[PDB]
Design an enzyme around this catalytic site. Sequence first.
Site, PDB file in Angstrom:
ATOM      1  N   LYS A 192       8.158 -88.457  24.222  1.00  0.00           N
ATOM      2  CA  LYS A 192       8.404 -89.859  24.558  1.00  0.00           C
ATOM      3  C   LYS A 192       9.782 -90.072  25.196  1.00  0.00           C
ATOM      4  CE  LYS A 192       4.467 -91.676  23.255  1.00  0.00           C
ATOM      5  NZ  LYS A 192       3.610 -90.899  22.357  1.00  0.00           N
ATOM      6  N   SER A 228       0.042 -83.875  15.743  1.00  0.00           N
ATOM      7  CA  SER A 228      -0.672 -83.816  17.024  1.00  0.00           C
ATOM      8  C   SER A 228      -0.547 -82.466  17.733  1.00  0.00           C
ATOM      9  CB  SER A 228      -0.249 -84.903  17.973  1.00  0.00           C
ATOM     10  OG  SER A 228       1.119 -84.726  18.318  1.00  0.00           O
TER      11      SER A 228
END
Lengths: 310, 310
Positions: free
Chosen positions: B41, B271
């Site tokens: 991110k 993830s």
Amino acid sequence: AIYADNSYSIGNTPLVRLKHFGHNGNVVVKIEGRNPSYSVKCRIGANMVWQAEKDGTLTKGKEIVDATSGNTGIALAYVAAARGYKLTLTMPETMSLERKRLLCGLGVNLVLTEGAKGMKGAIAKAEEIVASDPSRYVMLKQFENPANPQIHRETTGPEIWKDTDGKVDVVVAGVGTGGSITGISRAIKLDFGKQITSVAVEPVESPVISQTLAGEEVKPGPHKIQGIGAGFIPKNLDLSIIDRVETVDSDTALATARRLMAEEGILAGISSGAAVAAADRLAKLPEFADKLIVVILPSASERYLSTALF
Amino acid sequence: AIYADNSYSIGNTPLVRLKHFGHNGNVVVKIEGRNPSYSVKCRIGANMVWQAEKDGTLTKGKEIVDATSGNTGIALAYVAAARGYKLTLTMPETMSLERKRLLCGLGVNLVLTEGAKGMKGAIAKAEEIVASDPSRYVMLKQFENPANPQIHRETTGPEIWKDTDGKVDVVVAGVGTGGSITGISRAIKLDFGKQITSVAVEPVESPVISQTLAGEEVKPGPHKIQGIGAGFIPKNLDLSIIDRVETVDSDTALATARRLMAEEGILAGISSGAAVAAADRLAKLPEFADKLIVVILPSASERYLSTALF
């Protein structure tokens, strides 16, 4: 550029100019958080194992033993998993659930010692285990192993030389084992031939390097600047290359780490705050005003979620 | 190579070959943990702010608002501190002490909403604040902002092309906003002209991409694979470039993340386990046996110390 395992991916960490420290951006930081186990110790975790392989002290089947729940423990754990060694770390039973969980996550064989014995407990137990089967066990000894400073002389140091186009004038680094400052200093001073100023940083609560160099009484003490201030001169600190020793207190280190996050957007740990507080002090002396100061930030914030950092 | 602030230091993340997954090392991972706020991110935190500056929607004095306590929140926080914007994040009052502490550490103006309202609470409150002074506030909207996929097309994608000497055949990436897979896919397919296989990964508990592409009933659901499975098709997922969708369950993702740490010495988050479980599945089909599979590992372990990862 595909690394054959996670150990080969050490380093190449970035330099960032600070905006709210130093004078006209003379202070620049090397972010050692950007590493496989997220500390500077990854470089030594990698190199201590590679070196022990090359010299035959570590072979297939032999196991690694140590007594660290800190960054070196984590670094050894990553490398041992990457390279297929079982690792035993000893530690007092009183250690944090979190580092227990982290190390167990990494597949460390965790050996918990009596609480009361504390650190001494862990060291002795590992020594015992080594004795039990010397042919099966190897202790890498981060405080004295030359592979520690050496990795810094071949990677960390040259990365600094390269990223600054040889303009680095000052390296500021907190001392735990002494490997960082030692290796970096040897690289730039000896391999590149530049007479930089090497600055060691220690807690004012435990200023054993300063006391020793001053021929004063050595008085180690408790502090919160995790990663540095072991309370003795480790063999991997080459006193001969240190030009200056700066002391920083625990509160200043913590507040400085907070400023790095809140003002610079840099996610640094406790010792990063200490190293920067000392760099900022030198950076604001006219003698260092026009000089490029590079500061090692050994580790990332998050690792200190349970500490006074927050 | 001195970055003028922490935002410019995004990316250049490493590729590591896996040893206990795939077939003859056809599975390779990109470690997005090695970034300024320690997630993928950061790239979008950086680019969304740079882009809003270049187009004039973000100026000196204006403030940023969003409703995320996740990786994008952390990424926005780092960039805002690095670049001198005050940031407000809204979140339910029930959020973890730890992400509260982390974000407060980063100097976020934290606005806690009613517990009962939950996520909806946070979104509405940020929308309200924007309305209160539109000229003062900017919402960057990670789910729809083109600057999200774009950064991946200019950095993440080309880094993959370069590190694999154009040999990458398959990219596997879990979808949250869809930016990663979208940008990477556009770069390699369109800018480099290689017909790779783009594989999206979603939770089997919330397989909205698979359901949509199959023209089946869309049935989003709860899961533990943090970072992916938003429960809708975000605008930043370009369905046109997806060749395949793989589903993974929460337990498999967690166990796979554990295997990465314990067997590979790679400190990946939840993830990452999901993305690798799906890559391993394709890697063991004879059709993908001879093919180079690159898997995005979005984040680092530690961030998940309080989760089922441990």
